[PDB]
Every structure is written in C-alpha cells, then in structure tokens.
Amino acid sequence: MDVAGLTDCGLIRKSNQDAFYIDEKHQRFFIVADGMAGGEEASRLAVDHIRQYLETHLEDLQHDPVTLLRQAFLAANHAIVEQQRQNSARADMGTTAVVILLDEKGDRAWCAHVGDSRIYRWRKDQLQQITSDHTWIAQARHVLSQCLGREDLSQIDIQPIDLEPGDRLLLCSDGLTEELTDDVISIYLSEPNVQKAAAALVDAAKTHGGRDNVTVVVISV
Amino acid sequence: MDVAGLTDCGLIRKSNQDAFYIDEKHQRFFIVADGMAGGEEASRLAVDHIRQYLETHLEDLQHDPVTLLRQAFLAANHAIVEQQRQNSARADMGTTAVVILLDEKGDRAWCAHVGDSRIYRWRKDQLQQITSDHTWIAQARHVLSQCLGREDLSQIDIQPIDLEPGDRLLLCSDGLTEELTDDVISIYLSEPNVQKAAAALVDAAKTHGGRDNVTVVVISV
Ligand SMILES: [Ca+2]
Ligand SMILES: [Ca+2]
Ligand SMILES: [Mg+2]
Ligand SMILES: [Mg+2]
Ligand SMILES: [Mg+2]
Ligand SMILES: [Mg+2]
Known part of the structure; x- marks a missing residue:
C-alpha cells in the first residue's frame, strides 16, 4: 500500500488549522482534522489523542474497531473540552476529524x-463520497452540526x-x-x-482559488 | 521507595471484584478499584484504562497532573459506559477508583x-484519611453517590x-x-x-471478619 499526505494553508487563510497523521510505520490508521488560535489547538489535540489512543489500544481492541474508534474520538473530545476549561476563551474551539482504520489484512x-471533512473511495475512475457531512444543510450553509470539542x-x-x-x-x-x-x-x-496525486489535488485546490486550508491523505490499496 | 500490593477476596464474598495495579517499573502510579459479573469487569476496565492512559500520556502531561488524571479517569469512565452498551444487563456496572500519581521527584x-475506596497517609504513628468518601452519608449507609461507569x-x-x-x-x-x-x-x-505490612493489613481485615473483598497498596516513601 502507498500513502501520501499533504496539508497546505491555501491561498487566502492566514494560518493552517488543519492537521493530519499517517501511521507510516504500520500503515494502520490515517487522520485528518479541520479545526475552528483555538482551531489549531483543537485539530492538533484531536489528531494526537486519536493517534495515541489507537497506538495504545489497537492490539487490544482491533477486534472491536467501532468501540476502539468511539473511545479514540471521545478521548480527543474530552481532551478538547478540558482545554476549553480554563482555558481561556478557547471556550468554543472545535475540530472535525475523519479517520480511516484499516484492518490487519488491509482490505477493510x-x-x-x-x-x-470527508472520506472518499475511488475505483476505476469513479469516485464515491463515503461519509455524510455533519452540516445542517446536508441534513437538509449552516455549517457544522457536529464537531469534536463539545460536551454535547x-x-x-x-x-x-x-x-x-x-x-x-x-x-x-x-x-x-x-x-x-x-x-x-x-x-x-x-x-x-x-505522492503525485496528493500534490496535484492540493495544487488544483489552489489553482481553483485555494480559499481554505486544504489537507489530503491519499491511500492506494 | 518500597511498594507492596495485595488483594484478597476475604472470607465471605464469592468473588473478588477489586482490582489493583502498581507501576513496578517506574513506581509512578498506583491504582485500586472496587467494582460493583459486572463489578469485576468494571474494576478491571478502570485499572487497565487508567494505567494505559497514564503510561501513554505521562511523559506529555505529567506537568499537568490534574488534567492527566481527569482524562485517565474519563477514559476509564467511557470505556465502562461503552461496555454497558450493549453489553448486556452489565447495564449498571460501576467501580470505585483511587489513584496515586507521584511526581517525578517522588515526594508529591x-x-x-x-x-x-480510600487513600491514607501515615506518618510517625499517626494516620490521616486523605480522600472523602463519595457516599451519601459522608455527604451527611447509602452507599455510593459517585462511581465510574456513569454517564452522569x-x-x-x-x-x-x-x-x-x-x-x-x-x-x-x-x-x-x-x-x-x-x-x-x-x-x-x-x-x-x-510487604509484611500489606499482608498484615489484609490478614487483620480477615481476622476481624473479612466480610468484603479487601485490597491494599502500601507505599513507603
Ligand atoms: Ca478550519
Ligand atoms: Ca465491590
Ligand atoms: Mg475548512
Ligand atoms: Mg464546510
Ligand atoms: Mg467493597
Ligand atoms: Mg462502602
């Protein structure tokens, strides 16, 4: 399997509040987070806490990936909520997160x-969006109806x-x-x-206006 | 520093729902949990999740021990609440936990x-109870007003x-x-x-009736 990851501040935003992580050692999990300097701290906390939770508990819990991923995400959620207290006026920071955890065999x-933030799967020149955005509109801009850093x-x-x-x-x-x-x-x-695809995606997002921070992780199975 | 830990089912209860852990490698943290076979699972989850959270995050967070300990305890709480779902009719399992985290220097x-469950400190033949029991009575039997394994x-x-x-x-x-x-x-x-003190405490609890599971961790500074 080949993996590439890239983040870019884009052409308009002043700072990059996106974050990502690839397990380059074992290629088991991949994380992208889009924060909203509260946003930077929230996306960093989410990526680091999801990463560390998965590193620590993967051997023990990879047989129950839904529990593992929920606890990783709640570990991140709590960590963000604790920094909201004090902590200060970072009160409302939050972040999206998208995670792929591959099973050991690597084909799930x-x-x-x-x-x-989204996960897509591409096959034979066809693309499918896998995740459904937590936005009020997707629910049927808003924007977010859900983010990490909420007690709710x-x-x-x-x-x-x-x-x-x-x-x-x-x-x-x-x-x-x-x-x-x-x-x-x-x-x-x-x-x-x-590597060329990841760079091309980012470069194209910018060619087309780059109005936001842009982060991609590309995995070839 | 010398540390000893012992658990015993006691003379009446059928099973031991207490659990404990000592960091024998680095002597940094010590955990006792009294569960209420839901209770066994809850105390085991609390000890393992607090232990693993502390192992993973101690280097990073020992400078903010209150945040570290709150997140360790919430990691354990969430893990117990997720097993409550399904999971099944283990619906209400819960556990106490008492933890000591020593600072690096070892004198805090x-x-x-x-x-x-309690923490005490002993000095020169005088004993002081440090923790205040989460029981309705201590609040001013009940018994517990607080346990791990609650959404609340x-x-x-x-x-x-x-x-x-x-x-x-x-x-x-x-x-x-x-x-x-x-x-x-x-x-x-x-x-x-x-080692002799820990064994003597347990042995005395039993000499006096041993009506419950009994667990001690004794640390000499
Ligand atoms: Ca953002
Ligand atoms: Ca008990
Ligand atoms: Mg964005
Ligand atoms: Mg959006
Ligand atoms: Mg008891
Ligand atoms: Mg009691």
Whole structure:
C-alpha cells in the first residue's frame, strides 16, 4: 500500500488549522482534522489523542474497531473540552476529524468521522463520497452540526468499507471539496503515483482559488 | 521507595471484584478499584484504562497532573459506559477508583478518586484519611453517590499531598476500612517492611471478619 499526505494553508487563510497523521510505520490508521488560535489547538489535540489512543489500544481492541474508534474520538473530545476549561476563551474551539482504520489484512477500512471533512473511495475512475457531512444543510450553509470539542457530542459516524486492489481512499478537509468538484478530484486520484496525486489535488485546490486550508491523505490499496 | 500490593477476596464474598495495579517499573502510579459479573469487569476496565492512559500520556502531561488524571479517569469512565452498551444487563456496572500519581521527584502524591475506596497517609504513628468518601452519608449507609461507569459522572476528586521520608501511603478498598478502624490500620502501617505490612493489613481485615473483598497498596516513601 502507498500513502501520501499533504496539508497546505491555501491561498487566502492566514494560518493552517488543519492537521493530519499517517501511521507510516504500520500503515494502520490515517487522520485528518479541520479545526475552528483555538482551531489549531483543537485539530492538533484531536489528531494526537486519536493517534495515541489507537497506538495504545489497537492490539487490544482491533477486534472491536467501532468501540476502539468511539473511545479514540471521545478521548480527543474530552481532551478538547478540558482545554476549553480554563482555558481561556478557547471556550468554543472545535475540530472535525475523519479517520480511516484499516484492518490487519488491509482490505477493510473503518471510516469514522465528526464534521464535514470527508472520506472518499475511488475505483476505476469513479469516485464515491463515503461519509455524510455533519452540516445542517446536508441534513437538509449552516455549517457544522457536529464537531469534536463539545460536551454535547451526539454523533460519531463509523462504517466499514471493503477494499479492492487498486482502490484509492481519500481523507480530506473541506478545503479540497469547496474548490474541486468530485469529477475533478476523481481525475487526480487516477494519477498512479500517490505522492503525485496528493500534490496535484492540493495544487488544483489552489489553482481553483485555494480559499481554505486544504489537507489530503491519499491511500492506494 | 518500597511498594507492596495485595488483594484478597476475604472470607465471605464469592468473588473478588477489586482490582489493583502498581507501576513496578517506574513506581509512578498506583491504582485500586472496587467494582460493583459486572463489578469485576468494571474494576478491571478502570485499572487497565487508567494505567494505559497514564503510561501513554505521562511523559506529555505529567506537568499537568490534574488534567492527566481527569482524562485517565474519563477514559476509564467511557470505556465502562461503552461496555454497558450493549453489553448486556452489565447495564449498571460501576467501580470505585483511587489513584496515586507521584511526581517525578517522588515526594508529591496526586490523589484522585471516585467512590469510597480510600487513600491514607501515615506518618510517625499517626494516620490521616486523605480522600472523602463519595457516599451519601459522608455527604451527611447509602452507599455510593459517585462511581465510574456513569454517564452522569459528576465528580473526580483530585488533590496533592506532599510527602516526607518515612511516610507511608495506603490505597485501599472499603473491605479494609469496614473491618479495621483507623487506629488498627495505623499500627500495621508501622511495620517497617511494606510487604509484611500489606499482608498484615489484609490478614487483620480477615481476622476481624473479612466480610468484603479487601485490597491494599502500601507505599513507603
Ligand atoms: Ca478550519
Ligand atoms: Ca465491590
Ligand atoms: Mg464546510
Ligand atoms: Mg475548512
Ligand atoms: Mg462502602
Ligand atoms: Mg467493597
């Protein structure tokens, strides 16, 4: 499996409040977080706490990935809520998170998210959005109806997806998808080398205006 | 520093729902949990989740021990609440926990608890109860007003205590203190060898009736 990850502040925002992590050692899990300097702290806490929770508990709990991912996400949630106290006027910081946890065999991806960061799967020039955005509109802009850093955290969406060789998975913040249509994203995911695809996605988000922080993780199965 | 820990089912109860852990490698933290086979699972989850949270985050967070201990305890709380779902009719399991986290220097003890398990400090033949039991009566039997395994977890008491050479710390479940008065506990803590003191405390709890599971951790500073 090949994986590439890239974050970019984009062409308009002053700071990058997105964060990501790839388990480069074992390629088991992948995390993107879009914060809202409260946002930087929230996305960093989410990525670090989800990463550490998964590192610590993966051996013990990979047989129950939904419990593992819920507890990782709640560990992150609590950590953000504790920093909200004092802590100060970072009162309201929050972050999205999207996580892929691969099973040991590597052909099942547990997709977990809170917010409007996305997971997509690409296959043979067709792209599918896997996560459903936690926005009031997607519910049927708002924007967010759910984020990490709330005592009122009400939903952690988790679903498995089975994978085939040659599939790609994309974790992205909305800085990608507010600039690039899915049709455009799909073309860049067709680039064989995932490092080039990741860079091309970011570069295209910027070519198209880059109005937000943009983060991608591209995984080729 | 010398530490000894012992748990015993006692002379009446059928199973031991107490649990404990000593960081024998680095002597940084010590945990006793009294569960209420839901109780066994709750105390095991609390000890393991507090232990793992502290192992993972101690380097990063020992400079903010109250945040570290609150997040360790909430990690445990959440893990118990997730097993309550399904999980099944273990619906109501809960556990006390008492934790000592020593600072690096080893002469300050952060005492954290939920329930009616206790931390005591002994010095020069005098004993002091440090934690205040979360029972309705102590509030002014009930018994518990607080335990881990509640969505409604409302209190995690945490306080530091400074230590002198020759002090002893005792973590115990109420199986000790419902059989032995503090005057009696104090005498056994005067035993120089902490392994002998721990064994003597348990043995005395049983001599006096042993009506409950009894767990002690004895630390000589
Ligand atoms: Ca943002
Ligand atoms: Ca019990
Ligand atoms: Mg958005
Ligand atoms: Mg964004
Ligand atoms: Mg009691
Ligand atoms: Mg008891």
